[PDB]
């Protein structure tokens, strides 16, 4: 009935910001790759803490640990939380095995939080920010954010980080609390797209959200 | 730079609203199908004219005509226009050939308006509204149904209906993606009631989108 | 609590838009006055109908009729209405008596719709748009006071096409009435009028005693 | 014209937040008055620093110092600043002389920053927050914010501050950087308005906008 309806963000906790590092099948690890990834994690941890999130970081190197942690996030109660965030960071060179593993990891992650698998988040926004190395993942109140659209260029990681994660992090710093999230993501669209003169890196987001999304500060 | 930047909507023409009716490989045509499809076309034509669009309707039955028309829409100049819209309507029963042809038709339609193929629309929004059956900067992809959700009459289809409703009520008021989000909630609860079943849009837009008079 | 809370605009009726024409102590009525006022009235009636309002127009000439009508708008029930709007239009030259009568007329109008006198509107916005020719009127909760001109600033002449303020307001209402939050819309009117040219700036003003956001999204037939 | 145009907030400095304490001509100074006033000043100094302002505090007791400082803030250049803020705090009870001096002080304060008198601020917002103890200032890009509308009650000062300044400060803390300023002030309207003897009354604050653009205090 209401053209201004918002997801209720007045729960005790904001929620979890899961930052997932895809590192297992990569081989040539130039300092630009390594330092730039640290830059993207560190930057995202800052921005997401400031919006109230519990940031949790792990990589897929520790085969034994990803089991435990991944299991924890899924089963734990989110009843007292507003939303869930998951950032999937990856690298550029990407061999085919690395690239293939990526898709399977993202498919599992997303699949964990479908309402059928996770009652505590039902009706609450699930936001996935995916640094591709552009897909088809599904669910109501899901927000799929992609570093790059289907068949567009993706600039090499730098020691400073990646265009997408940088620019997102920037917008989050400046407009995190102010703007409706998809508006903010649209700003990230223009910013990155204006960063063989291939024409552009054009990021994307796919919304299955049913209400407005605001990260006004909590008490 | 400016968090409130908008696509410039002050050109001479608003733009073309292309309404594409997919019916070539369908054989079981109950009145609900045929009358509901007319309902979706007629309804969409009213709503979009009210937003200033030139509405053009054709189907893929006349294999001769589609060639000519499809060719026109691509080649013509859009320099004096704000944006481009394209609605792709398709029936629910859907055999496999019909389903398959759909994907191909959509693939081509969208491909026509990539900046690489269409300079007159560069920096302008290209909006595709796709009634599913079973890329580009400034592209907006709206789908009746997300990946692997259910998607269902004589008066029309939930998605096109609700869309049309929102367009009538908030077309001029709301930012487009916010208007689409209303359609998200409307449909996803229409299904819950008559019976999750959630529409979807994918934005590669860089600015805000308003259909002020 | 909720930084985005809105006055509930989902009542059966939008409400009344009262357009009040102050004409009684004016003497020289050049055609620019007479035609420009009609233009402001007609323009405002169009714009406010489009936003759902029952527009009602009267002037203070018919001293018998103003008694009835004024009482009607006060006493009638507004329980099934979103808000109330009142525009007070006046002329520029203004003799002292005309100017003085203006102040008293505004005092009374505004006074009628304080929650103390008008239960049906308690909690609902009361928007007065005043073409000045008092500014202490500003008393009420959920009151919005909009003035053609701030204290001690130039006021546009009236022209045959209407007045800068009412014109510009009506323009914004047409383009942004259903889209923007009202005070956001008024701020646009602030910039538009203040950049009207034809040395003196005119700077309009509004005083908000509103507690929520104000939107005039189109209503449901249902 | 752009329905979303904003005052350019990208200058080197945010600007000055002037907090002015009206003290002279006040006689009975109960601890609630004195402690509550410090509370309002300290609270506003925190909140305004957090939005980037140079906070400057003085009162009208030091008859020599007000001359100097008042002159300073007027004549100094603001070309490299976004806006100007000025809070005028007073005490509730108020003898008539105190009340009268208030009006004159506010009239002079506001008068200094009219574009006629102060070129460096022309086209920049001038925001006056006035705790009342008339309502006749003016100017383009001026924002006048009042603790209390004409002829409404104002709840007494307390040891923890005043309803208006408290609530304002709360919203500034929470929404200072997020919300458009008048949107934020409307939240103050509702908070205070919704707020042990002789009272069934409500306090309704007010603001008068002569602003031409949107006002946002995004972090610098």
From Swiss-Prot, chain B:
Phosphoserine: modified positions: 49, 188
GO BP annotations listed: activation of innate immune response; apoptotic process; cellular response to staurosporine; epithelial cell differentiation; hepatocyte apoptotic process; intrinsic apoptotic signaling pathway by p53 class mediator; positive regulation of apoptotic process; positive regulation of necroptotic process
Phenotype for residue 195 to S: Reduced palmitoylation, leading to increased cysteine protease activity
Principal location: cytoplasm
Family: Belongs to the peptidase C14A family.
Catalytic activity: Strict requirement for Asp at position P1 and has a preferred cleavage sequence of Val-Glu-His-Asp-|-
Post-translational modification comment from the UniProt entry: Phosphorylated by NUAK1; phosphorylation inhibits self-activation. Phosphorylation at Ser-188 by AMP-activated protein kinase (PRKAA1 or PRKAA2) inhibits autocleavage, preventing caspase activation, thereby preventing hepatocyte apoptosis. Palmitoylation by ZDHHC17 blocks dimerization and subsequent activation, leading to inhibit the cysteine protease activity.
Taxonomic lineage from the root: Eukaryota, Metazoa, Chordata, Craniata, Vertebrata
Free-text activity regulation comment from the record: During activation, the N-terminal disordered prodomain is removed by cleavage. Concomitantly, double cleavage gives rise to a large 18-kDa and a small 11-kDa subunit. The two large and two small subunits then assemble to form the active CASP6 complex. Can be cleaved and activated by different caspases, depending on the context. Cleaved and activated by caspase-8 (CASP8) and subsequently by caspase-3 (CASP3).
Protein name: Caspase-6
Lipid tethering residues (S-palmitoyl cysteine): 195, 200
Pfam families: Peptidase_C14
SUPFAM superfamilies: Caspase-like
Consequence when changing residue 105 to Q: Increased stability
Keyword Membrane: no
Lineage: superkingdom: Eukaryota
The protein's assembly and partners: Heterotetramer that consists of two anti-parallel arranged heterodimers, each one formed by a 18 kDa (p18) and a 11 kDa (p11) subunits. Interacts with BIRC6/bruce. Interacts with RIPK3.
Region (Tri-arginine exosite) residue spans: 12-14
Functional summary from the UniProt entry: Cysteine protease that plays essential roles in programmed cell death, axonal degeneration, development and innate immunity. Acts as a non-canonical executioner caspase during apoptosis: localizes in the nucleus and cleaves the nuclear structural protein NUMA1 and lamin A/LMNA thereby inducing nuclear shrinkage and fragmentation. Lamin-A/LMNA cleavage is required for chromatin condensation and nuclear disassembly during apoptotic execution.
GO cellular component, one term: cytosol
PANTHER family documented for this protein: CASPASE (PTHR10454), CASPASE-6 (PTHR10454:SF206)
Enzyme Commission number(s) from the entry: 3.4.22.59
Swiss-Prot record, chain C:
Effect recorded for residue 205 to S: Reduced palmitoylation, leading to increased cysteine protease activity
Resulting phenotype, residue 194 to A: Abolished phosphorylation, leading to caspase-6 activation
Gene3D superfamilies attached to this UniProt entry: 3.40.50.1460
Lineage: superkingdom: Eukaryota
Listed InterPro entries: Caspase-like_dom_sf, Caspase_cys_AS, Caspase_his_AS, Pept_C14, Pept_C14_caspase, Pept_C14_p10, Pept_C14_p20, Pept_C14A
Effect of residue 133 to A/S: Catalytically inactive active-site mutant
Modifications the protein undergoes after translation, according to the UniProt entry: Phosphorylated by NUAK1; phosphorylation inhibits self-activation. Phosphorylation at Ser-194 by AMP-activated protein kinase (PRKAA1 or PRKAA2) inhibits autocleavage, preventing caspase activation, thereby preventing hepatocyte apoptosis. Palmitoylation by ZDHHC17 blocks dimerization and subsequent activation, leading to inhibit the cysteine protease activity.
EC number(s) from the headed UniProt entry: 3.4.22.59
Enzyme class: hydrolase
Main location: cytoplasm
Presence of keyword Oxidoreductase: no
Catalytic residues (UniProt): 91, 133
Similarity comment: family membership: Belongs to the peptidase C14A family.
Functional summary from the UniProt entry: Cysteine protease that plays essential roles in programmed cell death, axonal degeneration, development and innate immunity. Acts as a non-canonical executioner caspase during apoptosis: localizes in the nucleus and cleaves the nuclear structural protein NUMA1 and lamin A/LMNA thereby inducing nuclear shrinkage and fragmentation. Lamin-A/LMNA cleavage is required for chromatin condensation and nuclear disassembly during apoptotic execution. (Microbial infection) Proteolytically cleaves the N protein of coronaviruses such as MERS-CoV and SARS-CoV. The cleavage of MERS-CoV N-protein leads to two fragments and modulates coronavirus replication by regulating IFN signaling. The two fragments produced by the cleavage interact with IRF3 inhibiting its nuclear translocation after activation and reduce the expression of IFNB and IFN-stimulated genes. The same mechanism seems to be used by other coronaviruses such as SARS-CoV and SARS-CoV-2 to enhance their replication.
Assembly description: Heterotetramer that consists of two anti-parallel arranged heterodimers, each one formed by a 18 kDa (p18) and a 11 kDa (p11) subunits. Interacts with BIRC6/bruce. Interacts with RIPK3.
Protein's recorded name: Caspase-6
């Amino acid at each position: 009935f209401d053209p201004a309806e918002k997801y209720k963000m007045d729960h005790r906790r904001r929620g979890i910001a899961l930052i997932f590092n895809h590192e297992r099948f990569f081989w040539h690890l130039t300092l630009p790759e390594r330092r730039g990834t640290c830059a993207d994690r560190d930057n995202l941890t800052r921005r997401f803490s400031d919006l109230g999130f519990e940031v949790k970081c792990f990589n897929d190197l520790k085969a034994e640990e990803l089991l435990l942690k991944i299991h924890e996030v899924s089963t734990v109660s989110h009843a007292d939380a507003d939303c869930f965030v998951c950032v999937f960071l990856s690298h550029g060179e990407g061999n085919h095995i690395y690239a293939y593993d990526a898709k399977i990891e993202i498919q599992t992650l997303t699949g964990l939080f479908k309402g059928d698998k996770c009652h505590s988040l039902v009706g609450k926004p699930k936001i996935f920010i995916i640094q591709a190395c552009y897909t088809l993942p599904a669910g109501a109140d899901f927000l799929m954010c992609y570093s790059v659209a289907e068949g567009y260029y993706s600039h090499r990681e730098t020691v400073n980080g990646s265009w997408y994660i940088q620019d997102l992090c920037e917008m989050l710093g400046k407009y995190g609390s102010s703007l409706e999230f998809t508006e903010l993501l649209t700003l990230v669209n223009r910013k990155v797209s204006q960063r063989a003169i291939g024409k552009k890196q054009v990021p994307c987001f796919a919304s299955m959200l049913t209400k407005k999304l605001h990260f006004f500060p909590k008490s």
